């Protein structure tokens, strides 16, 4: 099995290393999003 196609190059970036957070809603399906919901406040501690 030769790697004939899709020799994807993997690059690394450190611009948003400490500023990237992964949020997920276990109760909200992926079909409906919170784009139309007007966000009011986001209180977070470093």
Partner 1 sequence: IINIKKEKRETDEETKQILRMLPKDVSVAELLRELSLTKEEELLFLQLPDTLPGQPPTQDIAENACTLADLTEGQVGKLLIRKSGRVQLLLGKVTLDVTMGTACSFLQELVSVGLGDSRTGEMTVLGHVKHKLVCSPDFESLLDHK
Partner 2 sequence: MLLFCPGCGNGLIVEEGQRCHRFACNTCPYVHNITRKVTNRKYPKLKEVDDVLGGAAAWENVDSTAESCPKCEHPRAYFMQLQTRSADEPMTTFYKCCNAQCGHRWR
Which residues contact partner 2 (rule: CB under 8 A)? 27-28, 32
Least separation in angstroms between CB 39 and partner 2: 16
Least separation in angstroms between CB 33 and partner 2: 11
Least separation in angstroms between CB 42 and partner 2: 19
Give the number of residues in contact with partner 1, rule: CB under 8 A.
36
Q: Which of 15, 19, 8, 12 is nearest to 44 (CA)?
A: 19
Give the integer Cα–Cα distance in Å for 33 and 25: 10
Q: DSSP label at 3?
A: -
């Amino acid at each position: 099995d030769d790697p004939v196609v899709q020799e994807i190059d993997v690059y690394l970036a450190k611009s948003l290393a400490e500023k990237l957070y992964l949020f997920q809603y276990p109760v909200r399906p992926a079909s409906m999003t919170y784009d139309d919901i007007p966000h009011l406040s986001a209180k977070i501690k470093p």
